[PDB]
Design a protein around this nucleic acid. Structure first.
Length: 274
RNA sequence: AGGACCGAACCGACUAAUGUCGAAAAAUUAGCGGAUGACUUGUGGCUGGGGGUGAAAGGCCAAUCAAACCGGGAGAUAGCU
RNA sequence: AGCCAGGAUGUUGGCUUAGAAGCAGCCAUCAUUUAAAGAAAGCGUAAUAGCUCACUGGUCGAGUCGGCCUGCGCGGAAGAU
RNA sequence: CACAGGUGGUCAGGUAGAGAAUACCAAGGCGCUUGAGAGAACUCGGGUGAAGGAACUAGGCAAAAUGGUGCCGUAACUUC
RNA sequence: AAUUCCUUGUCGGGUAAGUUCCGACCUGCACGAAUGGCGUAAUGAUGGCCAGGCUGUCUCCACCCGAGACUCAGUGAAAUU
RNA sequence: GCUCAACGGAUAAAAGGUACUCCGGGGAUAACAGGCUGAUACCGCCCAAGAGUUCAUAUCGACGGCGGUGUUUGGCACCUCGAUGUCGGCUCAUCACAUCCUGGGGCUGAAGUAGGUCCCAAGGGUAUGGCUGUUCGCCAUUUAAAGUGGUACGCGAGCUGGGUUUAGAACGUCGUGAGACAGUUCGGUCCCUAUCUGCCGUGGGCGCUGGAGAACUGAGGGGGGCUGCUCCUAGUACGAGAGGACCGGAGUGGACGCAUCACUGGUGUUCGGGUUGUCAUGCCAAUGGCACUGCCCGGUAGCUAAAUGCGGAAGAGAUAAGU
RNA sequence: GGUAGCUAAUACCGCAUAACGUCGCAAGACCAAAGAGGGGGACCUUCGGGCCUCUUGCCAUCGGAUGUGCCCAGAUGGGAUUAGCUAGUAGGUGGGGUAACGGCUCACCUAGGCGACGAUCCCUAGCUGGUCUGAGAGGAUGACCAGCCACACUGGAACUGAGACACGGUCCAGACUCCUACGGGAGGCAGCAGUGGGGAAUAUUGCACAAUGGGCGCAAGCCUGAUGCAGCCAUGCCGCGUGUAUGAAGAAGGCCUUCGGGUUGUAAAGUACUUUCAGCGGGGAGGAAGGGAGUAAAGUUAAUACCUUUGCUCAUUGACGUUACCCGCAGAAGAAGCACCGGCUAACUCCGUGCCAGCAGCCGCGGUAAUACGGAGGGUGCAAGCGUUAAUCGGAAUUACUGGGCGUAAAGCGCACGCAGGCGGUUUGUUAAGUCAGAUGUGAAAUCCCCGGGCUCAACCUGGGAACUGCAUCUGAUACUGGCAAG
RNA sequence: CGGCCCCCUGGACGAAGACUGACGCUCAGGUGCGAAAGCGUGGGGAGCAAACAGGAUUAGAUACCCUGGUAGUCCACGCCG
RNA sequence: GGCCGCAAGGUUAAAACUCAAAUGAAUUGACGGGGGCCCGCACAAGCGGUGGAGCAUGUGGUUUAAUUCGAUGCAACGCGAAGAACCUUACCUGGUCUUGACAUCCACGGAAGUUUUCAGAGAUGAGAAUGUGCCUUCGGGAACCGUGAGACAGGUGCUGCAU
RNA sequence: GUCCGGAUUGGAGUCUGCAACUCGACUCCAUGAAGUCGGAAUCGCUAGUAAUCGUGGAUCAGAAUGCCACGGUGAAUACGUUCCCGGGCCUUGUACACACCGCCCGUCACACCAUGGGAGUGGGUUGCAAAAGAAGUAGGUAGCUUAACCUUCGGGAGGGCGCUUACCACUUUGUGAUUCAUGACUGGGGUGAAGUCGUAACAAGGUAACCGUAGGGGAACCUGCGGUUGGAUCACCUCCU
RNA sequence: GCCCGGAUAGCUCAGUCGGUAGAGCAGGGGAUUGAAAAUCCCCGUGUCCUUGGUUCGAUUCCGAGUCCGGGCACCA
């Protein structure tokens, strides 16, 4: 597949191939679906590479919708030679979406040296490792603040990674109590169409959950703007070409990480769990 | 040499067809299995019914067996037809 | 009842102010030219319009419109020699 | 029952054959106590089979097949 | 599994396709150590399964050859009603 | 002086199994089958929340409403216990229509192709295999499609007997035990000559008004009716493009039926030849007999299908839904 | 392709005829051949010729040289978790066959043969001179060149020929391309280039027969992808070069800095100078011996002809090749890298990142002051090269013959007996196998080494010796080992 | 290898003489012996004691410790090596 | 895999892979539920206490705007602190100023100082009055208060595992 | 629960100090708690000591139940080194060396790597037993055809094509041997900064270890029988001539 | 289906015909005696299956309910 797609990208620059870093899927992109159809045909004939054609996996994220306080995590494993003691108490709270470029906030509010300052980075690191694989469906956790304010150590049995284990326990229990939700991307879509073909474009966009922001009547006709989920923005090239008799051109860009509609989010949560 | 091997006589009786008011109240035609052996067989006796005999099925004891057959109790009984 | 006419400016009114425009929708849901227009019945609009009707004029020029109580019928009603 | 059944021992030939098998005959004895026509279906004891070769079926049941002496050759496992 | 109900369990081998067959996993409804457990060369008119030879078993049946059926003359039943 | 507690108390004293079974009875009473009924099952319809971007009614249709059929699991015990052979398969069917295909249309969220849904329609047609006892089901490959059901869950005086259903046995389990188990495993008698309805055929008598030999008319009745692909129409109508036709025409095939033997083959124990064992013809030579025609190699006429001709129409009339 | 006629020859076939040829005890028997060219006196011309003379070929025989075939011995990988193997197999006689011998092949008889110093089977593999290594002994390995062997799309066979069981020949079957009129054909780069592929990776679809070598020819000659040269590639070795000389404020700028200075460092500019080599333009050996016309002489002959043999002169024979080589000119101009700098190991510090990013051959460095991780100055090695990786030997006396071990570090079988195998007291004699000595034969040349020479030197090329450590023979020597005999 | 006794029997050693005359050393393969525990058959079984049971102990103690206790230890013949 | 064995198993006998060591003797220590010996309120023999009570004080913990910070087996916990009402004070809220409260240097202006008033929680702000001394080159300088300049000053900020 | 105890709370004060609200000391009047000798455990002290009684100081404006000093009164016991704690010397064992708070073993859980077995599956190479017979030779030849040699000169001799036989290539079938690959599952081995359950070895490692065998058991191991030292300890006390 | 029975600390029961519960183990302040352990001296952890009523004045009685399990559901 890699070899075949490389040859096709070399002869046709308008054809792009990348691996999506999140899904690990090979994504192919082209100047229309009939274009991609010919590319796929050549790949599975000239090179004869057996492949399935699907849709770019929507980048699902994870977050909470409820502050939880006083979440205890106590890794107390005093067994097997010497013990490993670690004890942390954290508050977990949602951030506003995109309010932090890091998607994560850590507040150290330890008072009284209940935790030695040397173990605080190991607690933060234990949380940050758990943010990579969320407790709901195993997607990355975003838009969340954690305040470490209470904890305890043992002079002989306390370890850096023991406090990291305690942090993970506290996080997993807190996250389940915090009403966890599955997130979604939304794509800003712009469609240029003749004025007489305008109507059809939006009829289909409405079925594709496209929140029409507005329109900019241009010389060709109308420049309609809509917020459409990535999931519903697939196969649009040929669909538009059908509604507009082949005189329409759209563009799309990633807008923001909004909340997936309860129905959509829950359906995927169940499917992932299965 | 062998409860040895292949196969007739003799002894058995797996399979299919027939015949099933039959040729015959269990056999015939076509293969089968055993065949010096815990082999088969003629003639003469011994065990008698709640008992015999049984490489053991309630199988056999005169086409009669979870208790024969044949006289007598006895014109058993029968709230059943 | 038809056959010829018209069937508005405020008002793209706003709430979401994206505009939600007389026609997805709580809200004026009036005063006027008036015969009037509900400040829109109804299709048509991504979102207006569009084409029409409520209302009114002329016409030909008679009865006519809508429920209730009862008779009798019509449909609903397709099965195996 | 003038019944395609059962009944112990002796004698036991020629040619082919390992042979009392089996095949044709010898000595001897018999045609089986109902016959004559036609030459449909169908039932029975048998023969041949185009191309395909278990696709039939409960299931290779039945049928076809293999089939003799000499010599060459002979696997896993095995209590050798 | 001659033992497993569920259950055609699940995975692999075999076939175009395999509730049976073969080898395993172990969640043994409800295996088990002389009411013996587990293997085991050889043997078996023993159950299951596959490949081959070869064939009218079959797809789909045709023609031939003898004994009955049909007819001619003689003898002449039976179950049942 | 009795929990004689089965309380009108059969004894002072009493528990099972039978598929090894037996007798006497019963449709007084079950299983299989029919009948009445129709909860359930199946198909249809009523109200229309809401879904369907918008919009109840293109397509689904909640919560609730009303009926039809006699199709499954049942209720009843009406027929049969002096016997109704009781599942599945084979062979053979035949009606019903609530229709899987081919035919005719209406709406579409019907561009075209292809489909979604409902109405009219019973003329014909409606696979072959692995596994299983399987109806069923899953799978593989086809197909114009592999319809849903009455018919004693059609059909055993037609067939098989694998399953359930006798006696042998064995495993697990339940019992002290005999023995039990819609729990399992291996084995395991299917009987009849057709009297009378019925039915496929073929004849005798009389009759039909004098007798006889021919030819037809034709009241009435059966058989028959299916369809694919390819080309042309045209890569046209339609459509962004991809794709892609109705209406009409030609040809060429599969399943099924009809007739025939000219062609390609089968058979062809009555025709020719080869040959093994043996006997006879007096012997040699040559022939004849018997061994499944002895075993085989060919094959004329007939009979045959795998072979080869032909079919199923058009047209017309009156109509269904609809226009 | 087919048919029917015609024509030549050093093509083909009988005879004559032989020997020191073949066979056979002999006697006998029997065998073969081919002719062409130049010139000419008389002769003679059927007017070609005959005839003489010269040059070469043929046939037969005995030799020599070259080449080829066959045989014996010894050496020539790994494996015993391969121990038995074989029936033309071992041999004999007889027949056949081959250039010959031979189980090369048949017929019969005998029952052999091989094998623990390794038969049989399996795996691997072209062998050698040699090459790389090593102080040697050894270990690795067969690039290059040269000798031998094997193969020529795969399998098998033969023909022709002195010689193939045949790279650019034939026939058959197989697979794979190509043409076709569908009937049948055609083809084989492991020759030179070239292409696609495969791969980490290996070159131009060049020119010329000028010499050497080959083939044919009496010669001239033509062919020769042998060869002689050239293109492309640092792949390697060797050589030369990007100047040399002066010149301190010890400049600027760079970094270090106790910030005093140090360093880059005579390094630069400048100035004084030269022109190796690419540049430009000219001169310009040698690789060439020959051969040919002419000439003249000597042979040769009947003949000065012709031909043989020796000199003279003339015109000439170079793909390389705008040759090297030499001479002149203009301009500092056209010409320097790469690795490393913790330790082993030559060469040190500053800055950022902090068990993160990583580095590394080994030990190890990195957790907030990193000579080790990246930049900068500086240094060091090497140099048109420099690093890594792979690969062999060395170091490794870690397979120990030279040249090691086994009381406890790895290692004495549990112990014994014993066949084969290995080793053996002492005295004398003999032989002379081992061993030692001398000589001959060979041990190809190249390559290594030595002393020399020739390309400006070097690499490269060459002369002689040395070596080839070996085996075989002959003559010896006889201590020692062995064999034999008496002790 | 251990009471004592008998019978059969190996090997070593010492002294003074005699004899044979190197008849020698070592040993791959080969053959023989080879504690204890196991295994086979048939006996024997006091003691002792794997397994096993009970009591304690212990956090648990399927161990030490306690009480029992089968194989086994014993003999004849083999095997194992 | 072969051979042997009734079996247990024996005998013969590898390779992938992985590590940079594994091992031997001896040495100094350390440690021994090893031996000898020996010492101390270590024990034995005694007296009086803590742990229960209430209070003082320190710490842990939790609370809080902060509850400053360090000590935290013996060898921290009436410890740094031989003394926290403000001060101390490093902590907290709020109000403030920046070459600065503390030093050296520069340029200017004013003796320095003193008294007193308002505004302000205070820091400060605005003043209002008065004083006007010392050495003289008096164009002075510097004891001293302010304003501007850049050097710098400040840090109870971190690291006792740099010292 | 007292004329014991004096914690607590109300009012009344005095002083220090700018200042006593959090947050000072002391006086007065009133109020009068828990507590009736202290669980498990554990601390001090060998003579002017333990115990009790009171004074002064330093810090400081004020602010001791603490610290630092001072005198008063003034005990009990110590046979003794067996035992714990710590230490010193000598000898011994050791697998310990940021040194017994040391080392370190094997189940079990997860990921990974390479292998053994595995119903089998697909290749390679090859043995055997046979079948097969192109082309080419070699042997035979009923048949057709034929220049040069010969001929009684008719035709012979001899050859060629053709037929056939022997050898043998492709090719086929059957059955073995060996090797490469793969196979659900499965046995063990290795590796993996900080897993779970014990703690088997190293000291007499707390039952001396280890070897062979046998049995058992979640592990390490434990028990029997034999063997070895690659095992320490042999000193004190009672007694005796 | 039929029948029976139960549900009590996190777990399991003790216990009950009577409104208001015991133990360990998981959990313990303090023990243990470098440290912890072990967990030792001693302590707790429930609403005793729940309600609704009846009333030894309900988990209990009685029914309901909620759930699970057990034995039992065949014969033609």
């Amino acid at each position: 597949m890699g070899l075949a797609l490389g040859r096709l990208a070399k002869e046709d620059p308008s054809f792009r191939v990348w691996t999506d870093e999140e899904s690990n899927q090979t994504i192919i992109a082209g100047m229309g679906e009939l274009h991609l159809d010919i590319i796929v045909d050549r790949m599975k004939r000239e090179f004869n590479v057996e492949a399935n054609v699907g849709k770019p996996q929507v980048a699902y994220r994870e977050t909470i919708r409820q502050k939880v306080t006083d979440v205890e995590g106590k890794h107390a494993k005093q067994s097997g030679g010497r013990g490993q003691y670690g004890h942390v108490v954290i508050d977990m709270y949602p951030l506003e979406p995109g309010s932090n470029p890091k998607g994560y906030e850590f507040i150290n509010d330890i008072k009284g040296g209940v935790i030695p300052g040397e173990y605080i980075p190991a607690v933060d690191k234990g949380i940050q490792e758990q943010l990579k694989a969320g407790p709901l469906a195993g997607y990355p956790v975003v838009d969340m603040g954690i305040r470490l304010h209470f904890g305890s150590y043992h002079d002989v049995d306390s370890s850096e990674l023991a406090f990291k284990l305690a942090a993970s326990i506290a996080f997993k229990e807190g996250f389940k109590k915090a009403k966890p939700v599955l997130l979604e991307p939304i794509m800003k879509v712009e469609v240029e169409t003749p004025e007489e073909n305008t109507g059809d474009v939006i009829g289909d966009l409405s079925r594709r959950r496209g929140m029409l922001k507005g329109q900019e009547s241009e010389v060709t006709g109308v420049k309609i703007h809509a917020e459409v989920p990535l999931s519903e923005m697939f196969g649009y090239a040929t669909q538009l070409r059908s509604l507009t008799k082949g005189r329409a051109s759209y563009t799309m860009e990633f807008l923001k990480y909004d909340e997936a509609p309860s129905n959509v989010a829950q359906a995927v949560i169940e499917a992932r769990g299965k």
